[PDB]
Amino acid sequence: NITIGRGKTARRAYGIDEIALVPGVRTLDPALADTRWKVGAIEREIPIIASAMDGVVDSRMAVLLSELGALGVVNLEGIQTRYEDPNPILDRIASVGKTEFVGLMQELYAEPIKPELITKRIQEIQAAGGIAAVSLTPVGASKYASTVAEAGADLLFIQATVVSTAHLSPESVESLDLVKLCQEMPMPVVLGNCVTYEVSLELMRAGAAAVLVGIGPGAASTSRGVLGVGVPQPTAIADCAAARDDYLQETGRYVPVIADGGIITGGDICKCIACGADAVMIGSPIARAAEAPGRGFHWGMATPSPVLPRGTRINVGTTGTIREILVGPAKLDDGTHNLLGAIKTSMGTLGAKDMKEMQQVDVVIAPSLLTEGKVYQKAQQLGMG
Amino acid sequence: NITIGRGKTARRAYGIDEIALVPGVRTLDPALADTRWKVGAIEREIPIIASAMDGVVDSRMAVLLSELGALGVVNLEGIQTRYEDPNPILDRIASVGKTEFVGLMQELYAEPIKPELITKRIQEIQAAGGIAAVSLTPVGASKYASTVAEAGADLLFIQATVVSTAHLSPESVESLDLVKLCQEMPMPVVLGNCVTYEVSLELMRAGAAAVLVGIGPGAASTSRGVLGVGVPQPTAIADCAAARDDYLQETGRYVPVIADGGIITGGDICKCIACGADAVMIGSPIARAAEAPGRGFHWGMATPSPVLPRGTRINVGTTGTIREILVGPAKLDDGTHNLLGAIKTSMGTLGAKDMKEMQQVDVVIAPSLLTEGKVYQKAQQLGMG
Amino acid sequence: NITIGRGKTARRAYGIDEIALVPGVRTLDPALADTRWKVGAIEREIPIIASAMDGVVDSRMAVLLSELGALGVVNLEGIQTRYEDPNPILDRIASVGKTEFVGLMQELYAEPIKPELITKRIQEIQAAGGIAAVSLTPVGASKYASTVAEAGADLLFIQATVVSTAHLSPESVESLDLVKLCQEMPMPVVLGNCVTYEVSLELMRAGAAAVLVGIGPGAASTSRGVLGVGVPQPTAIADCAAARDDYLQETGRYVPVIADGGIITGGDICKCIACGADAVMIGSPIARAAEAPGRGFHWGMATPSPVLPRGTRINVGTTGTIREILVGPAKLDDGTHNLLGAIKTSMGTLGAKDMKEMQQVDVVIAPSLLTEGKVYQKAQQLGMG
Amino acid sequence: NITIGRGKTARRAYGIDEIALVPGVRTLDPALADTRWKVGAIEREIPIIASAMDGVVDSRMAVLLSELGALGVVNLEGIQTRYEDPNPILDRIASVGKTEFVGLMQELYAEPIKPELITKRIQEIQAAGGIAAVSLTPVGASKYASTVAEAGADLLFIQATVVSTAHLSPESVESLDLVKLCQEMPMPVVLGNCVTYEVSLELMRAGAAAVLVGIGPGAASTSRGVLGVGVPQPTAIADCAAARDDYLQETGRYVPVIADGGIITGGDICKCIACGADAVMIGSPIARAAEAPGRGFHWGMATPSPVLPRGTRINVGTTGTIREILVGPAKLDDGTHNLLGAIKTSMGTLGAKDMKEMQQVDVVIAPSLLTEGKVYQKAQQLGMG
């Protein structure tokens, strides 16, 4: 309904920083707020998945997250499957200057994937009592999905900027048949990323166990600057949640919508749930953990592209343990600790008893939410500033 | 009427910095502008209440405010009822670094409330000739409202982020029956906070003497970042003023709407009145007084939460006496002094003879109000910048 | 047509920085662009009036401006009529620190007006061959309009934040009858300021020779922060130009609309003309002249209020002579020199042959006009940044 | 459809930073994306033209660009035709301080054009195997178009802020008849700049081989500040592309629309194509080449105006070779290298097989595209910040 100019129309899309949540007609104690989600047969108390990023998730973090009631995804195309000991490599990435990290990563990530390390990472996480969740790009799945199946991973994430049931490739590159993959894999398969109703619906029809929503909102993402592609998160989430609801009516199958990236605070999580997300996928808030493999740094997994980097490396620092970050007690005033407590406290304030009710809360378009009254916080770099 | 995406709608809400006031067809000398408001049987010449915050109101400030024609609320869950001498505690809060205040306050605020100090603060304010206005959260009122009644306070404020007539609690926590409280308390009971028509109407129907509007606009507030909850002030005020007007038609009872927080200048006050407020509640402008207990600092009363802080500590400085701040003469060029003079001068410019007429002034949506022509003021940190 | 909330409506108003001018179907050489305006019987080639501000206009500047084809207004309530030699006073104002100027001006401006100096300033400007244009507030005109008439000034400006035909005053203050003033004064009387159709129409009906539009856009203005009052300039200008056009149809009399303040560049002037202005009143761009009495500083004329300052002092610097600023050749790349050349070049680009055609150019709402492509200019403080 | 005020209407126009591109229902490998464009009989693989700016294009750069599959335009009114050896002049421009470059350029650019150097630049580019593309303003073409024709240039660009078929000039200045020029020139003639449907259609009807769209988006442009004139790029491009499509239906002739200026990244290019552009004209990204004549600086070609400069000089630095900037491999994370790879990767993501399909991609209005999640990148001056 918007005219850009003669013969070119558009629709308005809203970002995470443009919306706010409105109380209902009841309130509830946060201890009564049910935050569960489920993917396949796996129920989780914390509706947070740590991103498949080398500054965020290694084997230890995947286990720690699982034990807290959350999940972490190991990237099978990152350093974890290229080096038997990733630690010196992670140290090098964290130690070089702002003008050196692109070139360094272009080199370090050229070391080949060792399929024996795909098996090892999965089996060590499972041996330790963790849920083993692993990612591959569509081309990576053409080569290694059978290795993941043989290893017996609990969840497979096929994730890239876009993942399509209608991908055109030169005949030398094996395009991935997502319908065949979902049917043949012995575990649930999460597909993404997408930002539209039409694509999310197609991914669900192909057999996805969950869909990942988001193109470019990430803190370490440069895709929107490199390509111009993206839909801001509230709008993308709502459109994909509508596809979930239509797919549920058509088949009786519930495919959760995961809002992926661009989340820093508990308020950001809540705003994503209120737009329809069943769960969120976050990286930068978890890269701030004492146990995070990034050593206080966080980088995009397309930063090492040898031809066109589409991520950067940022310094997020280290603010607490992963336990403090997910379940507190919070040590900070900015909503970046005790993320589960923040979700339950927000649901309580809004009267939302469970995640489905949270997705039904009233929303306002409120670009002044993060700026009204905040001049001192911005000037002094405190609180929200 | 706004579509965020398929199946998710919203409405636009406007912040304090997005609106402006338009002159009418007459003007009047500021000396002719009537700024009075009334709560219960208490008439006040200055339609300003100092927030129940430990950097803003102690016993002395409550008396000084009362004598100037305003009001101040003592927080009965803060340091004033936990320590017989709050001064060394206030000094410690003001003296620690930006990375220490959360942890310090989490500890200092764990000292138990002394019910004898609730009685003492009320009686010392009254003995000194002040109006004794005190606050409790709903749980705090379940424990101490009978102590407040026995002490004979002039006003009770039941205040929290949200206060509900429909609160769900585990059975070990006593939910507060607001209808019973308003009926049984011997003094007027102010309830808040809220941001919607439906809740404000319910609070009025429960017996509120006034309603407090605002979730997260505060200068020392981090709730919007932690939770994602809030409605920007102009929209919240207007919706709650509509509830006041409907309640007045239904019962003949007038329940004033108090716009609470996010106000720095006289223009901010005026914009809140123009959206329907009968009075404003402000903290940071009063924390700048020479007599303010915060020693030039101002912190949110949820900063000391042991599990999830939802306020921060800011440095507001000290710019004048409380008399200069409320009634001048102003020493500054930025509208943060002589707040009563600013209200009367604005009402004069607009032709508003009284507060009810001020609530009826024409408003524009004008995001350029605070930026048009202001490049030098912003660059040089002068005036409005 | 905008809902702020239930029972509170608004309209959208646009600022100078939100609009842009669109070419027509012809272009013309700038030498062919007619920039004239007329007030009373006084025709001017340059449609710029220097503001009645003590950093901008003294007797010499009033003459220099007149001789260039522009105008300058001497404030008869400022330092020029309080001190026989204003120079040491102007030096003191320019020399004190950012924390001292309010208090200093509150004192310096308390020196009484000398009616002999009203006569002297007028007669010296006229003796020197300049057009003598002088300002008074409505109360100042009750006391001194007969002195201005006796001295034989060429134009009288009755100017304040608001000037009303319906002003309510205590009986000890003489309200000014604008109808009587316009009828009795022997010279044209310019009235302002206003921002609405209704008030501008009333000022025209009272006998105004021109109306001044603008509340708070000024570079040295703090009224919008102190009071919350104002309408951004494009909207205010358009509404007042509609009153001009209706008054012309009703009476056959043409009353020019002067856009007053918030202009820094030639583009700002052009945008104001395109919204309906016949001329502009500017201060800060002229305070940058080598001959400006402000010595590189520029302050609001309500900064010296002893009770509620509503202006500030800014440092504008000195960038050229008044000739360079109005007619070039320009020495700068930012459109703050050769303002007449900028108007003619803009009119040429748009195909506007005269000021009336410039007022009819197509406009877009374009908040990206000043930011699109400008990242380097902003970062390096060059050009538009 | 927008009301600025009574009697003044406007339409909303959108800038490059306000839009985003939405995936379709298929994706394709970037190697399959066809990026070609054509002007006259000249087909180009890279749909990028380097701006006719002295910091961007000299003879060597024109040849290097041609050989890479792009184009570069030599400005025949710049230093290249005024000095036999431009190098010492370019060195002087790059070496002076921020307060000196306007005055320096006003002097250096006053050296007369040598028509022998127009012939020489054209013939040296062609002798070296490059496509010789040259620019003149309309007045410059009245004097030198016959010299360009005699020299046998491959493309002539008649370019200025505006170029009109209906230009009014004093009789001492020869207005250019564009219809006669296009008919008589032996090579294709590109005309611009414009931002409207009506003007672009007239330029096409006059015989333009392509039209240049854009007034003031440039990184080194100050025209919008000096004049207030411009339409943000997405809206201007769409309106002019509608004129192209109508002209094609009326005549069967296809006139490409070139989006000119304000582009820094590959995403900026893609957003311009998606609004209807067949190709883009860029300066600042190419001024960052090791081979760029600006020595790391980039200035507007109206900066040297002796009366009213309408450009500035910025420091863009040097980030790679022109090969790295256009075709990679990229060394940076911000989308300013491998611009062709960025276009093909964006087209791939969107399912666009060719440039015409790219012009048909769905667009959202998304002011949060460049800010959502980007706080660390902005704070640390990394990636998109």
Ligand SMILES: NC(=O)c1ccc[n+]([C@@H]2O[C@H](COP(=O)([O-])OP(=O)(O)OC[C@H]3O[C@@H](n4cnc5c(N)ncnc54)[C@H](O)[C@@H]3O)[C@@H](O)[C@H]2O)c1
């Ligand atoms: N969500 C984002 O915005 C984003 C952007 C960049 C990178 N990443 C992250 O970085 C990593 C790499 O992602 P990437 O997009 O850079 O990877 P990539 O460039 O290696 O792979 C993605 C490409 O796969 C292709 N594709 C889509 N469906 C396919 C199919 N069925 N068969 C074969 N190919 C198909 C597309 O051309 C797509 O651009 C992932 O961990 C990912 O989460 C995310």
Ligand SMILES: NC(=O)c1ccc[n+]([C@@H]2O[C@H](COP(=O)([O-])OP(=O)(O)OC[C@H]3O[C@@H](n4cnc5c(N)ncnc54)[C@H](O)[C@@H]3O)[C@@H](O)[C@H]2O)c1
């Ligand atoms: N206005 C705001 O945005 C805001 C936000 C945070 C804190 N505060 C301030 O800080 C202090 C503490 O406020 P807080 O919200 O952090 O307090 P809190 O967390 O101790 O209490 C609030 C909680 O009380 C519960 N509640 C609502 N109605 C109830 C009822 N009838 N019975 C029992 N419980 C009920 C809700 O769960 C609500 O979240 C107050 O002085 C308050 O003004 C204000």
Ligand SMILES: NC(=O)c1ccc[n+]([C@@H]2O[C@H](COP(=O)([O-])OP(=O)(O)OC[C@H]3O[C@@H](n4cnc5c(N)ncnc54)[C@H](O)[C@@H]3O)[C@@H](O)[C@H]2O)c1
């Ligand atoms: N345009 C603005 O936004 C603005 C704002 C502040 C100051 N100023 C400038 O500063 C100077 C002083 O202006 P000020 O507004 O501070 O002056 P001021 O405060 O002395 O006088 C203005 C007051 O005069 C009264 N008024 C209106 N009509 C009247 C009438 N017919 N009779 C008697 N009184 C009437 C109003 O109460 C109005 O607020 C002027 O040079 C003026 O241009 C301009």
Ligand SMILES: NC(=O)c1ccc[n+]([C@@H]2O[C@H](COP(=O)([O-])OP(=O)(O)OC[C@H]3O[C@@H](n4cnc5c(N)ncnc54)[C@H](O)[C@@H]3O)[C@@H](O)[C@H]2O)c1
């Ligand atoms: N696109 C822009 O926003 C912009 C702005 C300023 C400068 N420039 C660049 O700087 C250089 C000079 O451009 P300029 O606009 O400063 O040049 P300029 O000022 O020398 O010439 C432009 C003037 O030519 C006139 N014109 C239009 N059609 C004509 C016609 N048929 N006959 C005769 N005159 C006609 C107009 O008065 C127009 O303003 C060019 O390289 C140009 O690309 C671009």
Ligand SMILES: O=c1[nH]c(=O)c2[nH+]cn([C@@H]3O[C@H](COP(=O)(O)O)[C@@H](O)[C@H]3O)c2[nH]1
């Ligand atoms: O544009 C991108 N370039 C990258 O290099 C990249 N790496 C990760 N991702 C995505 O970012 C999500 C994490 O977001 P945060 O860093 O904001 O937590 C992740 O979950 C991914 O969706 C990238 N996006």
Ligand SMILES: O=c1[nH]c(=O)c2[nH+]cn([C@@H]3O[C@H](COP(=O)(O)O)[C@@H](O)[C@H]3O)c2[nH]1
């Ligand atoms: O989100 C919040 N967290 C806190 O810790 C907090 N403490 C006070 N308040 C509220 O802020 C109001 C004062 O606002 P100012 O500081 O802007 O004057 C007060 O009147 C309260 O409404 C808080 N809000």
Ligand SMILES: O=c1[nH]c(=O)c2[nH+]cn([C@@H]3O[C@H](COP(=O)(O)O)[C@@H](O)[C@H]3O)c2[nH]1
């Ligand atoms: O709010 C105000 N407080 C003041 O103290 C003041 N002094 C001048 N003016 C007005 O500003 C106009 C000049 O505007 P610039 O400084 O932007 O040129 C002038 O022409 C006046 O309209 C003031 N406005």
Ligand SMILES: O=c1[nH]c(=O)c2[nH+]cn([C@@H]3O[C@H](COP(=O)(O)O)[C@@H](O)[C@H]3O)c2[nH]1
């Ligand atoms: O307002 C202007 N003043 C100037 O002095 C000027 N010089 C060039 N141009 C235009 O800018 C385009 C290049 O844009 P970038 O620098 O953003 O690449 C170029 O292609 C031109 O359209 C100018 N625009």
